Amino acid sequence: TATTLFWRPVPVHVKQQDREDVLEELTFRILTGVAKQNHNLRILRIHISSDSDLFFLHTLEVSEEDFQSLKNDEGILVDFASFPGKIISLLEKCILAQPGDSPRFQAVLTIRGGESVFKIVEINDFKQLPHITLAFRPGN
Amino acid sequence: FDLSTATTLFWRPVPVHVKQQDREDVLEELTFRILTGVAKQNHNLRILRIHISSDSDLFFLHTLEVSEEDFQSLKNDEGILVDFASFPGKIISLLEKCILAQPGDSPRFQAVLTIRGGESVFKIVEINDFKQLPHITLAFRPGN
Numbered sequence: 001t002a003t004t005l006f007w008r009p010v011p012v013h014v015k016q017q018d019r020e021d022v023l024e025e026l027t028f029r030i031l032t033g034v035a036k037q038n039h040n041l042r043i044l045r046i047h048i049s050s051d052s053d054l055f056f057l058h059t060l061e062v063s064e065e066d067f068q069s070l071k072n073d074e075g076i077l078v079d080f081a082s083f084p085g086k087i088i089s090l091l092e093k094c095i096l097a098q099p100g101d102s103p104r105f106q107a108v109l110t111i112r113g114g115e116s117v118f119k120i121v122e123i124n125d126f127k128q129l130p131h132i133t134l135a136f137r138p139g140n
Numbered sequence: 141f142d143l144s145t146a147t148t149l150f151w152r153p154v155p156v157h158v159k160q161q162d163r164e165d166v167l168e169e170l171t172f173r174i175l176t177g178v179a180k181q182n183h184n185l186r187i188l189r190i191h192i193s194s195d196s197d198l199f200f201l202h203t204l205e206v207s208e209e210d211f212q213s214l215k216n217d218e219g220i221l222v223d224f225a226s227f228p229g230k231i232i233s234l235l236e237k238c239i240l241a242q243p244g245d246s247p248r249f250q251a252v253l254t255i256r257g258g259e260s261v262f263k264i265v266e267i268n269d270f271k272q273l274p275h276i277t278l279a280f281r282p283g284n
Contacts, residue, residue, distance in 0.1 A: 075273065078269070078270060126220065126222060130273070
């Protein structure tokens with residue numbers, strides 16, 4: 001019963017444990033729908049995969065309850081329905097990113113043994129600052 | 141810190157949203173002073189000094205001092221890409237964005253001073269259509 005709002009490849013810096021940062025081409029899928037346990041709870045789903053690595057799967061599921069905790073931590077000002085639209089804008093900046101840009105937007109995925117932290121940062125002439133930080137889980 | 145051999149890079153009042161630990165909340169105009177120089181004990185150690193004051197309240201003092209050694213730890217945490225010498229200049233640009241901030245701007249830059257019982261945290265945040273995100277965060281100490 002899920003509906004896909006977003007399905008495009010996104011350039012992402014993948015950082016695995018004891019490796020080094022490497023720019024991989026990852027597929028992003030954003031879906032809206034209801035929980036498997038409860039049809040009254042709206043769920044926002046984000047799936048990260050790869051065409052090269054068929055076993056590279058990372059997933060985030062955000063309920064309206066989880067979004068409340070996310071609003072407090074990340075300082076989000078929008079509603080639940082407006083949340084995917086804001087992510088897509090940030091993702092597009094990573095897609096159209098060029099070396100000569102300032103500020104320059106980048107997507108980073110850091111994996112640490114069953115825990116993966118995804119973020120989209122801004123690189124300017126001063127520093128690197130995150131625009132969003134989300135916790136992902138390995139698998140589907 | 142040698143105050144006589146110090147060079148003032150920035151000295152003007154700056155619009156800052158002041159949060160006085162749930163005692164009062166007021167958008168007041170505070171005076172910022174950024175100075176570069178060397179330590180009084182050692183003239184080989186470069187020091188960066190930032191002083192926050194007020195023209196109305198003469199006992200409102202907050203100060204931050206960052207040495208070149210301390211800057212390395214700050215560089216790693218805040219993800220700073222410039223050197224110690226370029227560091228003050230970038231702060232002034234962020235401060236200027238708060239000065240030229242307008243209600244119709246997007247993104248809009250704001251300066252925030254949060255006091256927490258003998259502890260003061262200064263930051264410059266960005267307000268866009270999505271969220272509030274900090275561009276810089278500095279820990280200040282009450283007094284001179």
